[PDB]
């Protein structure tokens, strides 16, 4: 519902969706070749299935195809300084791909907007929605459209006859953070087959050890997992699958 939905917002009104309580799987994202660009900073995407994060924030917007280079830490531009600014120490990455077949119209898709004027550069991870007319003269514009009262936002001319740089592109950026809270979102790791009656090196949710996993009718264990003895020895364990 985030990467490919039927309705995506503009760059100046980028939708922010929180991903939490999720068993994330970035492997299918890596193996997908339908994304034009996929590169991450600070964390290599190869081992994203290992690290665990407390929360995940995803931002989705549609920008010009050539304007994709400005969405990066330490990048100065027009949309970067007026629509979406990223922190220098940003954790996460952007994933973008060509979407001319849906976001471009023969008569021109004019349903998308981008801001060209603001008083000052916006701080990283900030949203500006006010449509006030940017003034450049001495007399107050008072919101009346006319000369020397420039509208901060304009529309893209997304048409199939435009060049690749001018073609519409869909951008989705995911972010990670760590704070004083239990981690909830990360990969599912994996699970091997079970072999019994042979000396193996088992691993049951951190229960590291060796032994022969014979079948035993010990007791009911209505909600317990482990099983202990007079000393601190894990006599019996319950299968998780």
């Amino acid at each position: 519902e985030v990467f490919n939905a039927t309705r995506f917002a503009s760059v100046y009104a980028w939708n922010r969706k929180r991903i939490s309580n999720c068993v994330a799987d970035y492997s299918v994202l890596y193996n997908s070749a339908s994304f034009s660009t996929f590169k991450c900073y600070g964390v290599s995407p190869t081992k994203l299935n290992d690290l665990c994060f407390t929360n995940v924030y995803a931002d989705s917007f549609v920008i010009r195809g050539d304007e994709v280079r400005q969405i990066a830490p330490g990048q100065t531009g027009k949309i970067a300084d007026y629509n979406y600014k990223l922190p220098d120490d940003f954790t996460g990455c952007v994933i973008a791909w060509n979407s001319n077949n849906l976001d471009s119209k023969v008569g021109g898709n004019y349903n998308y907007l981008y801001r060209l004027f603001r008083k000052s550069n916006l701080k990283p991870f900030e949203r500006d929605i006010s449509t006030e007319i940017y003034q450049a003269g001495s007399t107050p514009c008072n919101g009346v459209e006319g000369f020397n009262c420039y509208f901060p936002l304009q529309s893209y001319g997304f048409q199939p006859t435009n060049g690749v740089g001018y073609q519409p592109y869909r951008v989705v950026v995911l972010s990670f953070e760590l704070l004083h809270a239990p981690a909830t979102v990360c990969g599912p790791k994996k699970s091997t087959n079970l072999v019994k009656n042979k000396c193996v090196n088992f691993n049951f949710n951190g229960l590291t050890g060796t032994g022969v996993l014979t079948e035993s009718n010990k007791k009911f264990l209505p909600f317990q997992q482990f099983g202990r003895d007079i000393a601190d020895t894990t006599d019996a364990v319950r299968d998780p699958q």
Partner: antibody
Amino acid sequence: QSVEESGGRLVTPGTPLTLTCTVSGFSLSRYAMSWVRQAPGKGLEWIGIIVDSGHTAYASWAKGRFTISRTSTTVDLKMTSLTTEDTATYFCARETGGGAFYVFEFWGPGTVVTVSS
Amino acid sequence: QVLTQTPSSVSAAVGGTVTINCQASEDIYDNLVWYQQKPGQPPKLLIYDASTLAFGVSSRFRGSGSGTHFTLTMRDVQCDDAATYYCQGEFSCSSGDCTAFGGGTEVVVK
């Protein structure tokens, strides 16, 4: 990848004419065809372009008197109501690859269309 | 929408260098290409994206510039470089008339 065209003739003003540009050695449905013209001793001028899908684009100075059509192997353009200042040399240019429009890496021999009495 | 090339004509010796400037009336990022047209010959693509040399062309041709100003300079021009050069760049679609060509310049080597 060889591109050639022909159809240059001497015609009276207002008489329609057809120039056909033929592709060779590549698939037409993958690259975009465009037409440029230059007057004798003058600079280059852009006429129009057709995309691989089939959409058409033109130039404001042309005013919309040209027509670009596509088919199997004949990229042809037709005009109507020629004037006396249209005596020039016409070209059809090929692209490099998918997308990257307005590159014009391959060019034809070039044909001259003259209008006089 | 408007493309301007300066100077219109410029000459230099074989052991010399010249500069050609092509300015765009609108922000085009780095979407600009150059061509060389010998008299009576089809133009040849020299530099695309304003900084990338085309295949099969010499390394003495270099391009630079971004935004609205671009510059192309020839180092150690030979007698084979006597031709005309043009700059072409996209102008969006709803914003400008697709693509327009520059006025061009003539280069003669003594």
